[PDB]
């Protein structure tokens, strides 16, 4: 692969898109540099026709995977580089969920010493009021809407915790108290909250002492927790997502311990408790999803009958009301010229993107930094 020998060092990249979406025609141009040795791209794109009719984040993937870092156990699998300098044809079908579709065809090749990506894109079936043409996606804000589902979960969790607080304080003060969540003799609410295990989870007093600041009614940790999850769900930084996930894992372990008490130790059926548990599971799942948005995995499999590759993956774009927009990608790559090519075993490219804005750019632009490194190929016994 003399091709891969083309990508030591820092190559100049040019990119040119001509696109038509639901009839609105537009042209994008981008210039930058590529470092296949660190898998790092830096690029600035400007729309040359005026107002871009779609959101910038939906054109990132259409807008040079030959700049990926292929590690040493994987050199025999880098198709993109091994097609150079003749280049390759990359074809994508990008389906947006409950919305339209992009069809793209690009040629990627060396022109002089410049890696050139030339794209024709055609989008159909878009709703002019949907997420795409309505410009309802997020670009890169620090703060954002928590979304309706996160809000339902956290407010319900908080209200239930404040109720359990009130209920604890009342059986403390009258042993004969019953609350709405006490029902006959099957479903119990008060004997649970006022047991050993309803303060500091029944653990603090043995580990830190009864005086501890941490020997609180469980519902105090509850209130703290649901408040936190709301707040962080309003943040869009990577560390916000890390905290969310780790606090959720704590909540999950606490739920399993408390349920092991509820059954098996106290023998009560507490509906408020089980609801708390379901909420914490939902939050944990959303925690997983939030955290997995920092890196996208492009799944590359070989396509021998066409002498190239095919690719599969999903993008989730943050929508301004707190939701997420799915973008299914199907991809084909076929060499332009001849000569041997490298047909890889199944593997993937791990991709991470950072969008930003030149404060000095009057035109409709996108500054894009990108890190891509390959993984997947199993190792040598």
Ligand X SMILES: CCCCCCCC/C=C\CCCCCCCC(=O)OC[C@H](O)CO
Ligand Y SMILES: O=C1c2ccccc2C(=O)C1c1ccccc1
Which residues does the annotation place in the binding site for (S)-warfarin?
Answer: 218, 277
Helices 238-261, 218-233: crossing angle, 10 deg rounding: 150
End-to-end CA distance of the chain: 26
Residue ranges in 172-270 assigned as alpha helix (H): 190-193, 204-207, 218-233, 238-261
Please select the residue that binds ligand X; options are 58, 61, 90, 251, rule is CB under 6 A.
251
Kind of pairing between the strands at 114-124 and 10-21: parallel
Question: Can you tell me which of 219, 248, 331, 333 binds ligand Y, judged by CB under 6 A?
Answer: 219
d(C-alpha 24, C-alpha 299), whole Å: 32
Instruction: Please report how the helices 271-291 and 218-233 are oriented relative to each other, as an axis angle in degrees rounded to 10.
Output: 30
Interacting span for ligand X (CB under 6 A) from 89-97, 106-114, 217-225, 352-360: 217-225
Task: Find the largest Cα–Cα distance for the chain.
Answer: 87
Q: What distance in Å separates the CA atoms of residue 229 and residue 219, rounded to the nearest whole number? A: 15
Q: Is 262 in the site for ligand Y (CB under 6 A)?
A: yes
Site string for ligand X, 151-180 (x = CB under 6 A): ----------x-------------------
Q: Name, in order, each residue with C-beta under 8 angstroms of 311's C-beta and a sequence gap of 6 or more.
A: 298, 299, 300, 301, 329, 330, 331, 332, 333
Q: Is 273 in the site for ligand Y (CB under 6 A)?
A: yes
C-alpha span between 261 and 174 (Å, rounded):
24
Distances in Å between the Cα of 149 and the Cα atoms of 140, 230, 250, 280, 320 are 21, 11, 21, 13, 14
- Looking at the Cβ atoms of 225 and 313, the one nearer to ligand X is 225
Please pick, from the candidates 131, 276, 331, 333, the single residue that binds ligand X as defined by CB under 6 A.
Answer: 276
Residues 125-164 that bind ligand Y (CB under 6 A): 160-161, 164
Q: Pick between residue 68 and residue 161 the one whose CB is nearest to ligand X.
A: 161
User: In this chain, which stretch among 66-74, 121-129, 182-190, 219-227 interacts with ligand X, using CB under 6 A?
Assistant: 219-227
Using CB under 6 A as the binding rule, whether residue 74 contacts ligand X is answered as no
Q: What is the phi-psi region of residue 229: left when phi exceeds 0, alpha when psi lies from -120 to 50, beta otherwise?
A: alpha
CA–CA dist 351, 366 (Å, integer): 18
Residue 198 interacts with which of ligand X, ligand Y, none, CB < 5 to 8 Å by class: ligand Y
Q: According to the binding rule CB under 6 A, does residue 221 interact with ligand X?
A: yes
Asked if 254 interacts with ligand X (CB under 6 A), we say: yes
Q: Does 198 bind ligand Y (CB under 6 A)?
A: yes
Interface stretch with ligand X, choices 234-242, 250-258, 327-335, 352-360 (CB under 6 A): 250-258
Residues near ligand Y, by CB under 6 A? 160-161, 164, 192-193, 195, 197-198, 218-219, 222, 258, 261-262, 272-273, 276
Residues near ligand X, by CB under 6 A? 161, 201, 203, 218-219, 221-222, 224-225, 228, 247, 250-251, 253-254, 257-258, 276
């Amino acid at each position: 692969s003399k091709g891969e020998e083309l990508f030591t060092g820092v190559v100049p990249i040019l990119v040119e898109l001509d696109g038509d979406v639901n009839g609105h025609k537009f042209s994008v141009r981008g210039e930058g540099e590529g470092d296949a040795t660190n898998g790092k791209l830096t690029l600035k794109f400007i729309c040359t026709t005026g107002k871009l009719p779609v959101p910038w984040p939906t054109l990132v993937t259409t807008l040079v995977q030959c700049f990926s870092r292929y590690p040493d156990h994987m050199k025999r699998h880098d198709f993109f580089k091994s097609a150079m300098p003749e280049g390759y044809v990359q074809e994508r079908t990008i389906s947006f969920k409950d919305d339209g579709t992009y069809k793209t065809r690009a040629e990627v090749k060396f022109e002089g010493d410049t890696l050139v990506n030339r794209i024709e894109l055609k989008g159909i079936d878009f709703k002019e009021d949907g997420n795409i043409l309505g410009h309802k996606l997020e670009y890169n804000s620090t703060w954002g809407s928590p979304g309706w589902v996160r809000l339902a979960l956290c407010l319900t969790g908080l209200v239930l915790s404040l109720y359990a607080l009130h209920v604890k304080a009342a059986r403390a003060r009258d042993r004969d108290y019953r609350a709405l969540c006490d029902v006959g003799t099957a479903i119990s609410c008060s004997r649970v909250f006022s047991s050993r295990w309803g303060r500091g989870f029944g653990l603090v007093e043995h580990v830190l002492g009864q005086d501890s600041i941490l020997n609180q009614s469980n519902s105090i940790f509850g209130c703290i927790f649901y408040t936190l999850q709301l707040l962080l769900g309003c943040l869009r930084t990577r560390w916000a997502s890390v905290l969310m996930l780790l606090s959720s894992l704590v909540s999950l372990a606490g739920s399993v311990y408390l349920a092991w008490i509820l059954f098996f130790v106290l023998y009560d059926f507490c509906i408020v408790c089980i609801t708390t548990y379901a909420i914490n599971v939902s939050l944990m799942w959303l925690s997983f999803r939030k955290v997995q948005e920092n890196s996208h995995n492009v799944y590359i499999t070989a396509d021998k009958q066409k002498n190239g590759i095919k690719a599969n993956f999903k993008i989730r774009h943050n929508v301004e009301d707190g939701s997420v927009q799915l973008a299914d990608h199907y991809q084909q790559n076929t060499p332009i010229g001849d000569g041997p090519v490298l047909l890889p075993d199944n593997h993937y490219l791990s991709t991470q993107s950072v969008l930003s804005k030149d404060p000095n750019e009057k035109r409709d632009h996108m500054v894009l930094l990108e890190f891509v490194t390959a993984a997947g190929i199993t190792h040598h016994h």
